[PDB]
Design a protein around this ligand. Structure first.
Ligand SMILES: *[C@@H](CCNC(=O)CCNC(=O)[C@H](O)C(C)(C)COP(=O)(O)OP(=O)(O)OC[C@H]1O[C@@H](n2cnc3c(N)ncnc32)[C@H](O)[C@@H]1OP(=O)(O)O)CC(=O)OCC
Ligand SMILES: *[C@H](CCNC(=O)CCNC(=O)[C@H](O)C(C)(C)COP(=O)(O)OP(=O)(O)OC[C@H]1O[C@@H](n2cnc3c(N)ncnc32)[C@H](O)[C@@H]1OP(=O)(O)O)CC(=O)OCC
Ligand SMILES: Cc1cc2nc3c(=O)[nH]c(=O)nc-3n(C[C@H](O)[C@H](O)[C@H](O)COP(=O)(O)OP(=O)(O)OC[C@H]3O[C@@H](n4cnc5c(N)ncnc54)[C@H](O)[C@@H]3O)c2cc1C
Ligand SMILES: Cc1cc2nc3c(=O)[nH]c(=O)nc-3n(C[C@H](O)[C@H](O)[C@H](O)COP(=O)(O)OP(=O)(O)OC[C@H]3O[C@@H](n4cnc5c(N)ncnc54)[C@H](O)[C@@H]3O)c2cc1C
Ligand SMILES: [Cl-]
Ligand SMILES: [Mg+2]
Ligand SMILES: [Mg+2]
Lengths: 436, 436
């Protein structure tokens, strides 16, 4: 089949590449509206921080290389502007010529992802971070204006990694967020170490704070405070790239996302949707779910590859919502339903704080583990973990537990790999089951 | 009921402690043959190495604190020398006065553990490591004799930690082992980094090497080498402390261990056995297992407490054999059947080797993950991981997967927590399922 793919990054490039693994005959074409394919989205703050300085780590492929290795045609600077599903084509604007044309398909795979929100000020010094063009522009602005003070707006994982990397590059960032509900995938009371990591390093922040006006480098805030910055990086959420889909027969939800079944099929035959654009359901509870993260784009890429050119009995079973962020010395990680989704069950909380490993062993640090569970069937609903060490391990295990519909009580039976550098003969996880 | 517990460390003190939590009225007494209760066996190599420096860290309790805190009577230097199971008493030698007496019980918990094998030489410079007494003596001997060259005999995990600690303390160990099966819970080819860590450090070692004769500080070896050593630490295996048991009606297997059922009951009513002395079966396959490790001591302890004083439907489901050792910069972890037990299955092997986390993120190292599965049912029999980073995590998750009978093909569905410091969007674990 002729396969057309919209978006040439996490969902899109990966999915094309998986299809090629199974099917060597079909013509595959990818339209990417911007300059680069398969940039490393998650590496971007580390590029800013000058932690990652080799471009080969920023960009996995170019169109020419992708064609030479995989025989996939990738057209950068090509924006898909409508889906003509009845005729089976897409209308595509070549942004270099401003010429538009139709491309036909047997299968269409939508992986357009999300775009960053802007705050809306007319400003030369304000940037958002979503792709590698952004990254290059922030790098260049910094060098050209010898940037010292940067204002970081927003408090999700992207803002946090950017803040940290700016600091490590040797700039002086300040963090503002419009409310006190920072890092909101994490339990609100378990986020305090973000604030302490800021204070320890004397990195200024103000919560319940917003930019009110901008006049060159003079920034006025809603607290009334007035300050000079050389740069602003705005991480205030994202919106789905689905405007171009609205005129088609593809069902969109009222937030502009694409509901799909366990095959990543849309309501329209032959059209798939994957990545941040796509919503599905939870694996362990009967609720809808959207998990705009990297594992999901990759896993769906694999399933859709199967659906099309391999084993169509392979189906998605739903999301767990496993996520994680590093911020300075601390790790923040959770899986399961979001905090606000908890209200939908009759639930209970158990928690424990302990050394990640043996106390006598050098370089310990308390690790806080929290698990919520359904009171009517004892099933794990959500877990959260924060600590300088071993949060990732605990949440990866609870992720596998949830996968298998485990009860909180059965956590006493988890057989841990024990030695002093690694955990405890009764691990925090076992302790969760005992304390339940 | 009146509860007598034999042995006051990982199984014994724990189990006593767990009973008291459920049960306030019963008289509990523990007899310990040696000087100290509740010492930290696993801390001891780190006490030798002075990585731990304050013995408060190596001793969780004293009889007086245990009695004030939990009202459990502990008698140290009191050796149980026989079980009179028909009358329900034990005979106990007071080692300080050399006088014996009998102690009646309604419930007898045996957690006597294992003792170190000796090579049997008459030698003032030879020590084994098994409790705090042994640690103090080794420590004292090093100081008293200005110990420089140390011969470390044996290559199990204990001997390995001891060797590393002697090194880090500033001494000069040499390692020998009677065969080349070093660190036997790990796949032999995966143990090579042990040998690279030694080589890199110029710590000498010789495998398939034995001691022939000791003449003062002059050691003669099987190979013909004759060397001078200031000290010898011998880790040549252990044997079960079951001699005091032979005259009773308790069933002993031919090696000295006690077969127990899923309640940790012996063939004799009212007598339980836990810790290293007890043998059970695996959880994922129908085979006998004995896993003489801490997790199993503590887990049995809790199960016996519930049996006696709590919810008696709580039972053991079997071992997985999860285990782990740090040696210098590397981790060696494994879980499932042992290497030799693989022969009892029709099996295949899959393996990945990739960075622990994002290649572009600093301090990356290659992590080797191997998974065995049963060809007849696709079920995971055994997993093993080696790398400076990330091994503990993978093996924990795999253990959680095996606990649930999960197949190798379902590892593709494992939702990892992904950010560049922690893993990949398609984790090593996921890669196992795709490569299978
Ligand atoms: C490994 C060598 C192998 N391990 C050992 O040799 C271990 C030696 N261990 C012992 O002697 C006993 O393990 C202890 C140290 C005396 C502890 O017994 P215990 O587990 O009953 O612990 P507690 O001191 O009573 O409790 C401390 C924290 O755990 C909570 N807890 C225990 N059990 C609980 C149940 N069933 N439900 C809820 N909570 C429970 C306690 O409440 C206590 O809480 P807190 O928050 O800290 O006040 C090397 C090595 O293992 O050596 C080092 C272990
Ligand atoms: C953020 C999350 C952003 N996520 C992203 O993914 C950023 C952009 N990613 C991409 O554009 C694509 O995902 C790639 C990396 C360009 C496509 O890679 P792929 O997954 O199709 O695998 P290949 O590039 O073909 O690499 C081959 C190595 O993996 C083995 N492999 C892949 N698929 C396999 C299946 N299905 N079965 C068995 N083996 C499979 C290959 O054999 C191949 O192995 P080899 O050892 O090299 O021979 C931040 C971030 O994540 O950015 C960075 C990711
Ligand atoms: C800075 C940053 C850090 C991140 N860190 C992490 C992390 O640590 N862990 C994690 O799990 N996830 C992380 N993510 C998110 C992760 O990168 C996304 O979840 C993933 O890339 C989503 O894949 P996608 O293909 O749906 O979206 P993207 O990879 O964003 O790709 C969508 C592409 O489609 C193109 N496109 C959109 N509309 C059109 C059109 N009409 N025509 C042609 N092309 C179009 C866009 O230009 C874009 O390139 C991070 C994201 C960013 C921005
Ligand atoms: C140096 C060292 C490092 C270790 N590291 C690890 C590790 O990293 N991870 C891990 O999982 N496991 C480790 N272990 C083993 C772990 O300690 C055992 O699996 C666990 O202690 C078993 O508990 P137990 O109660 O059966 O044996 P023990 O804890 O050894 O307790 C047995 C006690 O009973 C007493 N006793 C025996 N016979 C009698 C009698 N007749 N009367 C009275 N008292 C008696 C003994 O004196 C002994 O004090 C290590 C062990 C050692 C020695
Ligand atoms: Cl640069
Ligand atoms: Mg029309
Ligand atoms: Mg008799």
């Amino acid at each position: 089949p002729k396969i057309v793919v919209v978006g040439a990054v996490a969902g899109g490039a990966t999915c094309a590449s998986q299809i090629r693994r199974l099917d060597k005959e079909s013509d595959i074409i990818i339209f990417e509206k911007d300059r680069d394919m398969s940039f490393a989205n998650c590496a971007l703050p580390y590029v800013i921080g000058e932690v990652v300085e080799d471009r080969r780590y920023a960009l996995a492929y170019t169109p020419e290389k992708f064609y030479d290795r995989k025989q996939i045609t990738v057209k950068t600077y090509h924006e898909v502007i409508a889906i003509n599903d009845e005729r089976q084509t897409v209308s595509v604007l070549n942004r270099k010529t401003n010429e538009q044309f139709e491309e036909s398909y047997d299968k269409l795979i939508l992986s357009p992802g999300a775009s960053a929100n802007s705050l809306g000020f007319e400003s030369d010094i304000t940037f958002t971070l979503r792709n590698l063009e952004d990254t290059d522009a922030i790098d260049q602005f910094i060098k050209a204006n010898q940037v010292d003070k940067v204002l970081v707006v927003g408090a999700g994982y992207v803002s946090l990694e950017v803040l940290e990397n700016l600091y490590e590059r040797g700039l002086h960032p300040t963090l503002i967020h419009r409310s006190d509900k920072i890092n909101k995938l994490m339990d609100a009371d378990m986020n305090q170490p973000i604030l302490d990591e800021l204070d320890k390093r004397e990195i200024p922040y103000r919560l319940n704070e917003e930019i009110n006006a901008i006049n060159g480098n003079e920034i006025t805030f809603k607290s009334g405070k007035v300050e000079h910055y050389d740069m602003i990086i705005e991480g205030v959420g994202t919106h789905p790239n689905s405007k171009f889909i609205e005129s088609s027969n593809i069902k969109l939800d009222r937030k502009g996302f694409i509901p799909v079944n366990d095959k990543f099929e849309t309501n329209v035959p032959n059209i798939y949707a994957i990545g941040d654009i796509a919503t599905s359901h939870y694996r362990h509870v009967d609720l809808p779910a959207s998990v705009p993260l990297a594992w999901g784009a990759h896993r769906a890429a694999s399933i859709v590859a199967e659906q099309i050119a391999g084993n169509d009995t392979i189906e998605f079973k739903g999301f767990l919502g496993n996520n994680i962020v590093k911020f300075f010395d601390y790790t923040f990680a959770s899986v399961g339903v979001k905090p606000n989704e908890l209200k939908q069950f009759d639930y209970k909380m158990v928690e424990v704080t302990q050394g990640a490993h043996a106390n006598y062993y050098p370089g310990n640090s308390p690790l806080h583990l929290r698990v919520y569970y359904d009171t009517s069937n004892r099933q794990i609903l959500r877990a959260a973990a924060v600590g300088k060490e071993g949060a990732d391990k605990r949440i990866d295990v609870l992720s596998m537990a949830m996968m298998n519909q485990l009860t909180v009580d059965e956590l006493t039976e988890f057989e841990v790999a024990y030695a002093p550098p690694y955990s405890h003969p009764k691990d925090l996880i076992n302790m969760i089951g005992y304390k339940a």
